[PDB]
């Protein structure tokens, strides 16, 4: 499983003609680059601790593409405002998700190109990389404009070429800092409640990445399962509670790094 | 290696 994504954000400012553009890149759900407009000296800055293997030619060339993208979203924000005939006062947000995932062996499996205006979906490139999917009447205007020009061929060449080729460079430069997994530590805390019942809580502290599954298997198969939250230092944490009256039960933990499921009471 | 868009919205 190896992936690469480019999450672009464009939030306009009330009254100001220049909005704020944010381009953040990810390699296997891990951020390595970040660009901002409100920062003093807007340039691409290395976020990953292994991004020192790039010369000044890479940081200047990427800065050029970020400055160009900044102008593209600036115009597209005004073009979209007129489509819905929105009031020229408030601030609006335009987002884009462009990239591709390969899998175990390094080969293209699925390309991705999506656009979303104000959280809601707007236009997306299909799996065939030739036709587009629109959300409403205003999105159909963008579709005919991009089909008349033939923009589908331009985006197909990036996802097949430039994105795959540059992902191989990152995968080889930082293979030791990417393939690093940790076993999750478990502990169950006891808590009494009304009517003589006991609430059990299966904790999991210290795992990377957050792709984990905690299920309550009672004698070989109502439950309160919360979303995974990060610790902050570079690891993830998750817990699951069950309301059962009063007797020891087990909770199966499924992790990709662990060959056998780790489960232990108390 | 970020992508570059051609035709505006």
């Amino acid at each position, epitope marked *: 499983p190896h992936s690469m994504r480019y999450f672009e954000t464009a939030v306009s400012r009330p009254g100001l003609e220049e909005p704020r553009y944010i381009s953040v890149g990810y390699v296997d759900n891990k951020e390595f680059v970040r660009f901002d407009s409100d920062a003093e000296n807007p340039r691409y800055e290395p976020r990953a601790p292994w991004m020192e293997q790039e010369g000044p030619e890479y940081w*200047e*060339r990427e800065t*050029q593409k970020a400055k160009g993208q900044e*102008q593209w979203f600036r*115009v597209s924000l005004r073009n979209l405002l007129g489509y819905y005939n929105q009031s020229a006062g408030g601030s609006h947000t335009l987002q884009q998700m462009s990239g591709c995932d390969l899998g175990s062996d390094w080969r293209l499996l699925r390309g991705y190109l999506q656009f979303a205006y104000e959280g809601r979906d707007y236009i997306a490139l299909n799996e065939d990389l030739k036709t587009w999917t629109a959300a409403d009447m205003a999105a159909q205007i963008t579709r005919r404009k991009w089909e008349q020009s033939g923009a589908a061929e331009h985006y197909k060449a990036y996802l097949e070429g430039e994105c795959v080729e540059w992902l191989h460079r990152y995968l080889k430069n930082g293979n030791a800092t990417l393939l690093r997994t940790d076993s999750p530590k478990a502990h169950v805390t006891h808590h009494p409640r009304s009517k003589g019942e006991v609430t059990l809580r299966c904790w999991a502290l210290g795992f990377y990445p957050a792709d984990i599954t905690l299920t309550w298997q009672l004698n070989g198969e109502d439950m309160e399962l919360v979303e995974t939250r990060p610790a902050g230092d570079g690891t993830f944490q998750k817990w699951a509670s069950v309301v059962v009256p009063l007797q020891n039960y087990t909770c199966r933990v499924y992790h990709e790094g662990l060959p056998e499921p780790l489960t232990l009471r108390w | 290696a970020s992508n570059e*868009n051609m035709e*505006t919205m």
Partner: T-cell receptor
Amino acid sequence: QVEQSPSALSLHEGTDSALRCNFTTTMRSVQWFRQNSRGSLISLFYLASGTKENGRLKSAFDSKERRYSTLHIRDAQLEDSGTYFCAAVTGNTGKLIFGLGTTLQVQP
Amino acid sequence: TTVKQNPRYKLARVGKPVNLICSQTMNHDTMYWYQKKPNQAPKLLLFYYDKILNREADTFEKFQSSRPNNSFCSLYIGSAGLEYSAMYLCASSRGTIHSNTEVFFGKGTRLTVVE
């Protein structure tokens, strides 16, 4: 900046000579033009990276560092006499930066 | 397909104003206006990125410009002078200024200002 070489060139019929465009900084792409009898510019080649050939002419931008581009002319003919210009796309505000020009003259 | 540019030639007296039109069938977002004098390289005067005038070039405010729609763009001279006699060129590219797209040039318009 873009430095064009040579300033002027004189060839006999059938002579094979080449023009060179040298860039101080790295460029995203390059374009070669020939100036019209009326004074305007007609585009000859557009190169992203590689080598393009269209008859007697052949331009290249095969540099890994992207700091130079050449324009080869094979078998010079009197119908090729004129001023040639090279312009690279900077990748910044004011997209094209033009060279000073080369005045080619082919004697029959 | 190509950059249309009319008229072929323009004759105007010193003081009198001059209008210069330009048009393109393609949906090019960036348009340019160059000035090419005899024995000289074309000098950028201004560029437009979809109704956005970037007059960074031309540090003396010697030119005016108007781009009503994506297809049409104009170059205007308020008061003509002998300094303005040159071949005016119009150009267009697919992406933005920072893109590496081919810049297509028009056939030009030779202007000569007379006393």
